[PDB]
Coordinates of C-alpha atoms in Angstrom, one line a residue:
Chain A
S1 CA 16.7 16.9 -3.5
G2 CA 14.4 14.2 -2.4
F3 CA 10.7 14.4 -1.4
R4 CA 9.6 11.0 -0.1
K5 CA 6.0 10.0 0.7
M6 CA 5.8 9.7 4.5
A7 CA 2.8 8.2 6.2
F8 CA 1.4 9.5 9.5
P9 CA 2.5 7.7 12.7
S10 CA -0.1 5.0 13.3
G11 CA 0.0 4.5 17.1
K12 CA -3.2 6.4 17.9
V13 CA -5.1 4.2 15.4
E14 CA -3.5 0.9 16.4
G15 CA -5.2 0.9 19.8
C16 CA -8.6 1.3 18.2
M17 CA -8.6 -1.7 15.8
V18 CA -10.6 -4.8 16.8
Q19 CA -11.8 -8.1 15.3
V20 CA -15.5 -8.7 14.5
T21 CA -16.9 -12.1 13.7
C22 CA -20.4 -13.0 12.6
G23 CA -20.9 -16.6 11.7
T24 CA -18.0 -17.7 9.6
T25 CA -17.1 -14.2 8.4
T26 CA -14.4 -12.2 10.2
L27 CA -13.2 -8.7 9.4
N28 CA -11.8 -5.6 11.1
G29 CA -13.6 -3.1 13.3
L30 CA -13.0 0.4 14.6
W31 CA -13.5 0.8 18.4
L32 CA -14.3 4.4 19.4
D33 CA -15.8 5.4 22.5
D34 CA -18.5 2.7 23.0
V35 CA -19.3 1.8 19.3
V36 CA -17.6 -0.6 16.9
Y37 CA -18.0 0.5 13.3
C38 CA -17.5 -2.2 10.6
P39 CA -18.7 -3.0 7.1
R40 CA -22.3 -4.3 7.0
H41 CA -21.5 -7.2 4.8
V42 CA -20.1 -9.0 7.8
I43 CA -23.6 -10.4 8.2
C44 CA -23.5 -12.0 4.7
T45 CA -22.4 -15.4 3.5
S46 CA -20.7 -15.8 0.1
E47 CA -23.9 -16.5 -1.8
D48 CA -25.8 -13.7 0.0
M49 CA -23.3 -11.4 -1.7
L50 CA -24.9 -11.6 -5.2
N51 CA -28.2 -10.0 -4.1
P52 CA -28.1 -9.2 -0.4
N53 CA -31.2 -8.1 1.4
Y54 CA -29.5 -6.3 4.3
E55 CA -32.7 -5.5 6.2
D56 CA -33.9 -9.1 6.0
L57 CA -30.5 -10.4 7.3
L58 CA -30.1 -7.9 10.1
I59 CA -33.5 -8.3 11.7
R60 CA -32.8 -12.0 12.1
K61 CA -29.6 -11.4 14.1
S62 CA -29.2 -10.9 17.9
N63 CA -26.6 -9.2 19.9
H64 CA -25.0 -12.6 20.8
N65 CA -24.3 -13.4 17.1
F66 CA -21.6 -10.7 17.1
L67 CA -18.2 -11.7 18.5
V68 CA -16.1 -8.6 19.0
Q69 CA -12.6 -9.1 20.4
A70 CA -9.8 -6.7 21.2
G71 CA -6.7 -8.8 21.4
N72 CA -7.8 -11.4 23.9
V73 CA -10.4 -9.4 25.8
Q74 CA -13.9 -10.2 24.5
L75 CA -16.3 -7.3 24.4
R76 CA -20.0 -8.0 24.7
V77 CA -22.2 -6.5 22.0
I78 CA -25.1 -4.9 23.8
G79 CA -27.1 -3.4 20.9
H80 CA -26.8 -2.7 17.2
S81 CA -27.9 -0.4 14.3
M82 CA -27.1 0.2 10.7
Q83 CA -26.1 3.6 9.2
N84 CA -26.0 3.3 5.3
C85 CA -23.3 0.7 4.5
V86 CA -21.7 0.4 8.1
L87 CA -22.8 -1.5 11.1
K88 CA -22.6 0.1 14.5
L89 CA -22.1 -2.4 17.4
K90 CA -22.6 -0.8 20.8
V91 CA -20.6 -2.5 23.6
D92 CA -20.5 -2.4 27.4
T93 CA -17.0 -1.0 27.7
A94 CA -15.7 2.3 26.3
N95 CA -12.3 2.2 24.6
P96 CA -9.8 3.6 27.1
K97 CA -7.4 4.5 24.3
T98 CA -9.9 6.5 22.3
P99 CA -8.0 9.5 20.8
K100 CA -9.6 12.8 19.9
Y101 CA -11.2 12.0 16.6
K102 CA -13.4 13.4 13.8
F103 CA -15.3 12.1 10.8
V104 CA -14.6 13.9 7.5
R105 CA -15.6 13.1 3.9
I106 CA -12.8 13.8 1.4
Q107 CA -12.7 14.7 -2.3
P108 CA -10.7 13.1 -5.1
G109 CA -7.1 14.2 -5.2
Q110 CA -6.8 14.2 -1.4
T111 CA -4.2 12.1 0.5
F112 CA -4.3 10.1 3.7
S113 CA -2.6 7.1 5.4
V114 CA -4.1 3.6 5.5
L115 CA -3.5 1.1 8.3
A116 CA -3.8 -2.4 6.9
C117 CA -5.0 -5.0 9.5
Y118 CA -5.8 -8.7 9.3
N119 CA -8.1 -9.7 12.2
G120 CA -7.9 -6.5 14.4
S121 CA -4.2 -6.8 14.1
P122 CA -2.2 -4.1 12.2
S123 CA 0.2 -5.3 9.5
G124 CA 1.5 -2.2 7.7
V125 CA 0.9 1.5 7.0
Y126 CA 1.2 3.4 3.8
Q127 CA 0.3 6.8 2.2
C128 CA -2.1 7.1 -0.7
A129 CA -4.4 9.5 -2.5
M130 CA -8.0 8.9 -3.6
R131 CA -8.0 8.7 -7.4
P132 CA -10.4 10.8 -9.5
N133 CA -12.3 7.6 -10.2
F134 CA -13.0 7.3 -6.4
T135 CA -10.7 4.2 -6.0
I136 CA -7.6 3.7 -4.0
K137 CA -4.6 1.8 -5.3
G138 CA -3.3 -0.1 -2.3
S139 CA -2.3 -3.7 -1.2
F140 CA -5.4 -5.2 0.4
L141 CA -5.5 -9.0 0.7
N142 CA -8.5 -11.0 1.8
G143 CA -9.4 -10.1 5.3
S144 CA -8.4 -6.4 5.1
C145 CA -12.0 -5.1 5.0
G146 CA -12.6 -2.6 7.8
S147 CA -9.1 -1.1 7.5
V148 CA -9.5 2.7 7.9
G149 CA -7.7 5.7 6.4
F150 CA -6.8 8.8 8.4
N151 CA -4.9 12.1 8.8
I152 CA -3.5 13.5 12.0
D153 CA -3.7 17.2 12.7
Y154 CA -1.7 17.9 15.9
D155 CA -3.7 15.5 18.2
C156 CA -6.9 15.0 16.1
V157 CA -7.3 11.9 14.1
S158 CA -9.5 12.5 11.1
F159 CA -11.0 9.2 9.9
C160 CA -12.0 9.6 6.2
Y161 CA -12.1 6.1 4.7
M162 CA -13.0 2.5 5.5
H163 CA -12.2 -0.4 3.0
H164 CA -15.2 -2.4 1.8
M165 CA -14.5 -4.0 -1.6
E166 CA -11.9 -5.0 -4.1
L167 CA -12.9 -4.3 -7.8
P168 CA -12.0 -6.8 -10.5
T169 CA -9.1 -4.7 -11.9
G170 CA -7.2 -4.7 -8.6
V171 CA -8.4 -1.5 -7.0
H172 CA -10.4 -1.0 -3.8
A173 CA -13.6 0.8 -2.9
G174 CA -15.0 2.0 0.4
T175 CA -17.1 4.5 2.4
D176 CA -16.7 7.3 4.8
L177 CA -17.3 6.6 8.5
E178 CA -21.0 7.5 8.0
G179 CA -21.5 4.6 5.6
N180 CA -21.6 6.5 2.3
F181 CA -19.6 5.0 -0.6
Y182 CA -17.0 7.1 -2.4
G183 CA -18.1 6.9 -6.0
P184 CA -20.9 4.9 -7.7
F185 CA -20.0 1.5 -6.1
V186 CA -22.3 -0.8 -4.1
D187 CA -21.7 -3.6 -1.6
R188 CA -22.8 -6.3 -4.1
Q189 CA -20.8 -9.0 -5.9
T190 CA -21.9 -7.4 -9.2
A191 CA -20.0 -6.3 -12.3
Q192 CA -18.7 -2.9 -11.1
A193 CA -16.5 -1.0 -13.5
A194 CA -14.3 1.9 -12.2
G195 CA -14.0 4.8 -14.6
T196 CA -10.8 5.9 -16.4
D197 CA -8.1 6.9 -13.9
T198 CA -6.7 10.3 -14.7
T199 CA -3.6 12.1 -13.4
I200 CA -4.2 14.7 -10.7
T201 CA -3.0 17.9 -12.5
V202 CA -3.1 20.2 -9.5
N203 CA -1.0 17.8 -7.5
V204 CA 1.7 17.6 -10.2
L205 CA 1.8 21.4 -10.4
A206 CA 2.3 21.7 -6.7
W207 CA 5.1 19.1 -6.9
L208 CA 6.8 21.1 -9.7
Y209 CA 6.5 24.3 -7.6
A210 CA 8.4 22.4 -4.8
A211 CA 11.1 21.5 -7.3
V212 CA 11.8 25.2 -8.2
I213 CA 12.1 26.0 -4.5
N214 CA 14.6 23.2 -3.9
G215 CA 16.8 24.0 -6.9
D216 CA 15.4 22.1 -9.9
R217 CA 15.0 24.6 -12.7
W218 CA 15.6 22.8 -16.0
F219 CA 12.0 22.1 -17.1
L220 CA 11.0 25.8 -17.1
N221 CA 10.3 27.6 -20.4
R222 CA 9.6 31.2 -21.5
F223 CA 6.0 30.5 -22.7
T224 CA 2.6 31.0 -21.0
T225 CA -0.8 29.6 -21.9
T226 CA -4.5 30.1 -21.2
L227 CA -6.5 27.8 -18.9
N228 CA -8.7 26.8 -21.9
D229 CA -5.8 25.9 -24.2
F230 CA -3.9 23.9 -21.5
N231 CA -7.0 21.8 -20.7
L232 CA -7.4 20.9 -24.4
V233 CA -3.8 19.5 -24.4
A234 CA -3.9 17.9 -21.0
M235 CA -7.0 15.8 -21.8
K236 CA -5.0 14.2 -24.6
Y237 CA -2.6 12.8 -22.0
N238 CA -5.5 11.8 -19.6
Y239 CA -4.9 14.6 -17.2
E240 CA -7.6 16.1 -15.0
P241 CA -8.9 19.5 -16.1
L242 CA -7.8 22.5 -14.1
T243 CA -10.3 24.9 -12.6
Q244 CA -10.1 28.5 -11.4
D245 CA -10.3 27.0 -7.8
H246 CA -7.1 25.1 -8.5
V247 CA -5.3 28.3 -9.7
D248 CA -6.1 30.2 -6.5
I249 CA -5.0 27.3 -4.3
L250 CA -1.5 27.4 -6.1
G251 CA -1.3 31.2 -5.5
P252 CA 1.0 31.1 -2.4
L253 CA 3.3 28.8 -4.3
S254 CA 3.4 31.2 -7.2
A255 CA 4.1 34.0 -4.7
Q256 CA 7.1 32.4 -3.0
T257 CA 8.5 31.7 -6.5
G258 CA 8.2 34.1 -9.4
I259 CA 6.4 31.8 -11.8
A260 CA 2.8 32.3 -12.5
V261 CA 0.5 29.3 -12.5
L262 CA -0.3 29.6 -16.2
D263 CA 3.4 29.9 -16.7
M264 CA 4.0 26.6 -14.9
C265 CA 1.2 25.0 -17.0
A266 CA 3.2 25.8 -20.2
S267 CA 6.2 23.9 -18.8
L268 CA 4.0 20.9 -17.8
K269 CA 2.7 20.9 -21.4
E270 CA 6.3 20.7 -22.6
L271 CA 7.2 17.9 -20.2
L272 CA 4.3 15.7 -21.4
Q273 CA 5.3 16.2 -25.1
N274 CA 9.0 15.7 -24.7
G275 CA 9.3 13.3 -21.7
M276 CA 12.0 13.4 -19.0
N277 CA 14.8 12.6 -21.4
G278 CA 16.3 10.3 -18.6
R279 CA 16.7 13.2 -16.2
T280 CA 15.1 13.6 -12.8
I281 CA 13.0 16.1 -10.8
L282 CA 13.6 15.7 -7.0
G283 CA 14.9 12.2 -7.4
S284 CA 11.8 11.0 -9.3
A285 CA 11.7 9.7 -12.9
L286 CA 8.0 10.2 -13.2
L287 CA 5.6 13.1 -12.8
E288 CA 4.2 12.1 -9.5
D289 CA 0.7 13.2 -8.4
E290 CA 0.2 12.2 -4.8
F291 CA 1.4 15.3 -3.0
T292 CA -1.3 17.9 -2.3
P293 CA -0.8 21.6 -2.5
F294 CA -1.5 21.9 1.3
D295 CA 1.3 19.5 2.1
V296 CA 3.7 21.3 -0.1
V297 CA 2.9 24.8 1.2
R298 CA 3.8 23.8 4.8
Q299 CA 6.7 21.4 4.6
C300 CA 8.1 23.7 1.9
Chain B
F3 CA 1.5 -3.7 -4.5
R4 CA 2.7 -0.8 -2.4
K5 CA 5.8 -0.2 -0.2
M6 CA 4.4 -0.5 3.4
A7 CA 6.1 0.5 6.6
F8 CA 5.7 -1.3 9.9
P9 CA 3.2 0.1 12.5
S10 CA 5.1 2.7 14.5
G11 CA 3.1 2.6 17.8
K12 CA 5.5 0.6 19.9
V13 CA 8.3 3.1 18.9
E14 CA 6.3 6.3 19.2
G15 CA 6.3 6.0 23.0
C16 CA 10.1 5.9 23.3
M17 CA 11.0 9.2 21.5
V18 CA 12.2 12.0 23.7
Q19 CA 13.9 15.4 23.2
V20 CA 17.5 15.9 24.4
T21 CA 19.0 19.4 24.8
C22 CA 22.5 20.3 25.7
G23 CA 23.3 24.0 25.5
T24 CA 21.8 25.2 22.3
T25 CA 21.6 21.9 20.4
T26 CA 18.3 20.0 20.4
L27 CA 17.7 16.5 18.9
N28 CA 15.9 13.3 19.3
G29 CA 16.6 10.5 21.8
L30 CA 15.5 6.9 22.3
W31 CA 14.2 6.1 25.8
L32 CA 14.5 2.4 26.6
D33 CA 14.3 1.0 30.2
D34 CA 16.2 3.8 32.0
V35 CA 18.7 5.0 29.3
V36 CA 18.4 7.7 26.7
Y37 CA 20.4 7.0 23.5
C38 CA 21.2 9.9 21.2
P39 CA 24.0 11.0 18.9
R40 CA 27.2 12.1 20.7
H41 CA 27.5 15.3 18.7
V42 CA 24.7 16.8 20.8
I43 CA 27.5 18.0 23.1
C44 CA 29.1 19.9 20.3
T45 CA 28.5 23.5 19.3
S46 CA 28.4 24.4 15.6
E47 CA 32.0 25.6 16.0
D48 CA 33.2 22.4 17.8
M49 CA 32.3 20.2 14.8
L50 CA 35.5 21.0 12.8
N51 CA 37.8 18.9 15.0
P52 CA 35.8 17.7 17.9
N53 CA 37.6 15.8 20.7
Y54 CA 34.6 14.2 22.3
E55 CA 36.4 12.4 25.1
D56 CA 37.7 15.8 26.3
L57 CA 34.4 17.7 25.7
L58 CA 32.5 15.1 27.8
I59 CA 34.8 15.3 30.8
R60 CA 33.8 19.0 31.3
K61 CA 30.1 18.3 30.9
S62 CA 28.0 17.3 34.0
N63 CA 24.5 15.8 34.5
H64 CA 22.8 19.3 34.7
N65 CA 23.8 20.3 31.2
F66 CA 21.3 17.8 29.7
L67 CA 17.6 18.5 29.5
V68 CA 15.5 15.4 28.5
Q69 CA 11.8 15.9 28.0
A70 CA 9.2 13.1 27.4
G71 CA 6.3 15.2 26.3
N72 CA 5.7 17.5 29.2
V73 CA 7.6 15.6 31.9
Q74 CA 11.2 16.2 32.8
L75 CA 13.7 13.3 33.3
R76 CA 16.9 13.8 35.3
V77 CA 20.1 12.6 34.0
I78 CA 21.9 10.8 36.9
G79 CA 24.8 9.6 34.7
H80 CA 26.4 9.8 31.3
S81 CA 28.6 7.5 29.2
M82 CA 29.5 7.0 25.6
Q83 CA 29.7 3.9 23.4
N84 CA 31.7 4.9 20.3
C85 CA 29.3 7.4 18.7
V86 CA 26.2 7.3 21.0
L87 CA 25.6 9.0 24.3
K88 CA 23.9 6.9 27.0
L89 CA 22.1 9.2 29.4
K90 CA 20.9 7.4 32.6
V91 CA 17.7 8.8 33.9
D92 CA 15.8 8.5 37.2
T93 CA 12.6 6.9 35.8
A94 CA 12.1 3.8 33.7
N95 CA 9.9 4.0 30.6
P96 CA 6.7 2.0 31.3
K97 CA 6.1 1.9 27.5
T98 CA 9.3 -0.1 27.0
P99 CA 8.5 -2.9 24.5
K100 CA 10.3 -6.1 23.9
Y101 CA 13.3 -4.9 22.0
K102 CA 16.7 -5.9 20.7
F103 CA 19.7 -4.2 19.1
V104 CA 20.8 -5.6 15.7
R105 CA 23.2 -4.6 12.9
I106 CA 21.9 -5.1 9.4
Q107 CA 23.7 -5.5 6.1
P108 CA 23.4 -3.4 2.9
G109 CA 20.3 -4.2 0.8
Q110 CA 18.1 -4.9 3.9
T111 CA 15.0 -2.9 4.6
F112 CA 13.5 -1.3 7.7
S113 CA 11.1 1.4 8.7
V114 CA 12.1 4.9 9.9
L115 CA 10.2 7.1 12.4
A116 CA 11.2 10.6 11.4
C117 CA 10.9 12.9 14.4
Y118 CA 11.4 16.6 15.2
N119 CA 12.2 17.8 18.7
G120 CA 11.0 14.4 20.1
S121 CA 7.7 14.5 18.2
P122 CA 7.0 11.7 15.8
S123 CA 6.1 13.2 12.4
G124 CA 6.1 10.4 9.8
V125 CA 7.1 6.9 9.0
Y126 CA 8.5 5.4 5.7
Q127 CA 10.1 2.2 4.5
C128 CA 13.6 2.2 3.0
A129 CA 16.5 0.0 2.2
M130 CA 20.2 0.4 3.1
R131 CA 22.0 1.3 -0.1
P132 CA 25.1 -0.7 -0.9
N133 CA 27.1 2.5 -0.3
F134 CA 25.9 2.5 3.3
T135 CA 23.5 5.5 3.0
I136 CA 19.7 5.8 3.0
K137 CA 17.7 8.0 0.7
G138 CA 15.5 9.3 3.4
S139 CA 13.6 12.5 4.3
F140 CA 15.3 14.2 7.2
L141 CA 15.5 18.0 7.7
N142 CA 17.1 19.9 10.5
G143 CA 16.1 18.6 13.9
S144 CA 15.6 14.9 12.9
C145 CA 19.0 13.7 14.1
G146 CA 18.5 10.7 16.5
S147 CA 15.5 9.3 14.5
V148 CA 15.5 5.5 14.6
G149 CA 15.0 2.8 12.1
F150 CA 13.4 -0.5 13.1
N151 CA 11.9 -3.8 12.0
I152 CA 9.1 -5.5 13.9
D153 CA 9.2 -9.2 14.7
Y154 CA 6.0 -10.7 16.1
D155 CA 6.2 -9.0 19.5
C156 CA 9.9 -7.9 19.3
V157 CA 11.1 -4.5 18.0
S158 CA 14.6 -4.7 16.4
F159 CA 16.3 -1.4 16.4
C160 CA 19.0 -1.3 13.7
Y161 CA 19.7 2.4 12.8
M162 CA 20.0 5.9 14.2
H163 CA 20.3 9.1 12.1
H164 CA 23.5 11.1 12.7
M165 CA 24.5 13.1 9.7
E166 CA 23.1 14.6 6.4
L167 CA 25.3 14.4 3.3
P168 CA 25.5 17.0 0.6
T169 CA 23.6 14.9 -1.9
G170 CA 20.3 14.3 -0.1
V171 CA 21.5 11.0 1.3
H172 CA 21.9 10.4 5.0
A173 CA 24.2 8.4 7.2
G174 CA 24.0 6.9 10.7
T175 CA 25.0 4.2 13.1
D176 CA 23.6 1.1 14.8
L177 CA 22.4 1.4 18.4
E178 CA 25.9 0.5 19.7
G179 CA 27.4 3.6 18.0
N180 CA 29.1 1.9 15.0
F181 CA 28.6 3.7 11.7
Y182 CA 27.4 2.1 8.6
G183 CA 30.0 3.1 6.0
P184 CA 33.2 5.2 5.9
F185 CA 31.9 8.3 7.7
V186 CA 32.8 10.2 10.8
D187 CA 30.8 12.5 13.0
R188 CA 32.6 15.7 12.1
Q189 CA 31.7 18.6 9.8
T190 CA 33.9 17.9 6.8
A191 CA 33.6 17.2 3.1
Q192 CA 32.3 13.6 3.1
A193 CA 31.4 11.7 0.0
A194 CA 29.3 8.5 -0.5
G195 CA 30.7 5.9 -2.8
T196 CA 29.2 4.7 -6.1
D197 CA 25.6 3.5 -5.6
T198 CA 24.7 0.1 -7.1
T199 CA 21.4 -1.5 -7.7
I200 CA 20.5 -4.4 -5.4
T201 CA 20.2 -7.2 -7.9
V202 CA 18.6 -9.8 -5.5
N203 CA 15.9 -7.3 -4.5
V204 CA 15.0 -6.6 -8.2
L205 CA 14.6 -10.4 -8.8
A206 CA 12.3 -10.7 -5.8
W207 CA 10.2 -7.8 -7.2
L208 CA 10.0 -9.5 -10.6
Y209 CA 8.7 -12.6 -8.8
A210 CA 6.0 -10.4 -7.2
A211 CA 4.9 -9.3 -10.6
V212 CA 4.4 -12.9 -11.8
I213 CA 2.3 -13.5 -8.7
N214 CA 0.3 -10.5 -9.6
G215 CA -0.2 -11.9 -13.1
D216 CA 2.3 -9.8 -15.2
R217 CA 4.4 -12.3 -17.1
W218 CA 5.4 -10.6 -20.3
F219 CA 9.1 -10.4 -19.5
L220 CA 9.3 -14.2 -19.2
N221 CA 11.3 -15.8 -21.9
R222 CA 12.4 -19.3 -22.9
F223 CA 16.1 -18.8 -22.2
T224 CA 18.3 -19.4 -19.1
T225 CA 21.7 -18.1 -18.3
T226 CA 24.6 -19.0 -16.1
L227 CA 25.7 -17.2 -12.9
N228 CA 29.0 -16.0 -14.3
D229 CA 27.5 -14.8 -17.5
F230 CA 24.9 -12.7 -15.6
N231 CA 27.6 -11.1 -13.3
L232 CA 29.4 -9.8 -16.4
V233 CA 26.2 -8.2 -17.5
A234 CA 25.5 -7.1 -13.9
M235 CA 28.5 -4.8 -13.5
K236 CA 28.2 -3.2 -17.0
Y237 CA 24.9 -1.8 -15.8
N238 CA 26.0 -1.4 -12.1
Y239 CA 24.2 -4.3 -10.5
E240 CA 25.4 -6.1 -7.5
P241 CA 27.2 -9.4 -8.3
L242 CA 24.8 -12.3 -7.5
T243 CA 26.0 -15.0 -5.1
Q244 CA 24.8 -18.6 -4.7
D245 CA 23.4 -17.6 -1.3
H246 CA 21.1 -15.2 -3.2
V247 CA 19.8 -18.1 -5.2
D248 CA 19.0 -20.0 -2.0
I249 CA 17.3 -16.9 -0.6
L250 CA 14.9 -16.8 -3.5
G251 CA 14.0 -20.5 -3.4
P252 CA 10.6 -20.1 -1.7
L253 CA 9.5 -17.7 -4.5
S254 CA 10.9 -20.1 -7.2
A255 CA 8.5 -22.8 -6.0
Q256 CA 5.4 -20.6 -5.8
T257 CA 6.0 -19.6 -9.5
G258 CA 7.9 -22.4 -11.2
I259 CA 10.4 -19.9 -12.6
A260 CA 14.0 -20.6 -11.5
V261 CA 16.5 -17.9 -10.5
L262 CA 18.8 -18.3 -13.5
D263 CA 15.7 -18.5 -15.8
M264 CA 14.5 -15.2 -14.2
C265 CA 18.1 -13.9 -14.5
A266 CA 17.7 -14.3 -18.3
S267 CA 14.7 -12.0 -18.2
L268 CA 16.5 -9.4 -16.1
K269 CA 19.6 -9.5 -18.3
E270 CA 17.4 -8.9 -21.3
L271 CA 15.6 -6.0 -19.6
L272 CA 18.9 -4.2 -19.0
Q273 CA 20.2 -4.5 -22.5
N274 CA 17.1 -4.0 -24.8
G275 CA 15.3 -1.8 -22.3
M276 CA 11.6 -2.4 -21.5
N277 CA 10.2 -1.8 -25.0
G278 CA 7.8 1.0 -23.8
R279 CA 6.1 -1.3 -21.2
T280 CA 5.4 -1.4 -17.5
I281 CA 6.0 -4.0 -14.7
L282 CA 3.5 -3.5 -11.9
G283 CA 2.7 0.0 -13.3
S284 CA 6.4 1.0 -13.2
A285 CA 8.7 1.9 -16.0
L286 CA 11.5 1.5 -13.5
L287 CA 12.9 -1.6 -11.8
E288 CA 12.3 -1.4 -8.0
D289 CA 15.1 -2.6 -5.7
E290 CA 13.8 -1.7 -2.2
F291 CA 11.7 -4.9 -1.7
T292 CA 13.7 -7.8 -0.2
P293 CA 12.7 -11.4 -0.8
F294 CA 11.3 -11.6 2.7
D295 CA 9.2 -8.5 2.2
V296 CA 7.6 -10.1 -0.9
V297 CA 6.8 -13.3 1.1
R298 CA 5.3 -11.2 3.9
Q299 CA 3.1 -9.0 1.6
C300 CA 2.0 -11.8 -0.8
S301 CA 2.1 -15.2 0.8

């Protein structure tokens, strides 16, 4: 009983964060071998943000307008280029603490750790999932732009996210490390509306399969359902539809246990209509949707 | 508003693996000493009635294998400080940070670096429950994992995992080997007391929601201390002290809502429920944010 959200150890990322200053704007950077990646709106003032002409602004900058600074050691920017929504500052010195790394683009429903920094200086680390509306629900105060998100597989850090914007309703938007935004958002101070946030159905089902394995058995029922009927009910509760791909991913979980996936779907349908009735499932009072099937199938 | 943990890098470089006979667990490598739970010298049969001060006399320096990654450290000496083995090694840790050993009180928070066989696996933030347990995530092999807080450049180590209770809760000691709570390092039926809700932490979390713009629970009424305490026990909340009022003073200025005024809101949430509403997206009242955590994360 008890399945708490753990974040990856952050040491390998801590030695890569730096501070980038252009004019009066300062944000965070990512120092890998000889390149500093940072959001391209570092070259903007506040009234450039409404309608920024990024090509007009960049062509007027020189290498000496970029102050990059790792702790107290000043790096000299030696050339620069722009890939989509990120700026790449190439420096004279390679980072001696570069880990083995990789750039991956993730899909909604996937989890990762975020390292929040304020001036090339880490402050805290937490675990999150990217919501189906391509936003992340974190704590990002002013000056956290450039914070990255990552997973660690053995010794390989997989960078998947870089914070760019906060949206008016409190949530945050960003790009991959190749400069492509997740979702329909842009790096303008425009009226940008995130879509409806929906619960990640396949994550909840994987969590419920973990409960059966660790002893919790009270929510099960004798009924089964079709994939079509379940999706008609789930959408009334703002749950993401389930695909045949999701069913096969849950297969090993339905093999360790005896409960078929559509069998577990009937129980979830019952939970939504009745509620918890003040009981718990693995120490949690809510159906909780930020554990992926992959994480469950291993730590099982 | 999320529950963040401290960056773990300064502690990641101190974790090692300690093996004695068949038992393997995690150790803390600082300067030239490895700290680890003393039950590493016990077999699974020795834990019924272990007599450590006799079991250690027979042991010698060659029965301990300490690995820091691929290297091997020799133990050149051993000693014991109440529940913790201090193994003296031949090489000093060049990653040793500015550190300090402190003992915390129930209700305070810290980060835990969960480790398996000397390998850091994850980190999470938690609070010491009033019954002297922590609701953590340790499986077999995570004994010796450490809890810590991070001052500006100084790491304060406050906890070491020793045992796992038959409820999901876990128990441990400070770095000088003194247990938190009425527990012993034996295999016997051990029970944690009645868990209470940390009242001062819930109040600080309600101040955080006002700062984030949720103010629906605010009301015109105020209550006394003594009146609130009587309500507090009936719903198993810690009695509130005048010190707690003075702890929350910084957050009372930033909002304009006084502690006893906010206490009237909390008293009303416990009796009449929350009316099918949410505070910071939660239908539940969070109690693992200290007042200091709210100041750190917000102002």
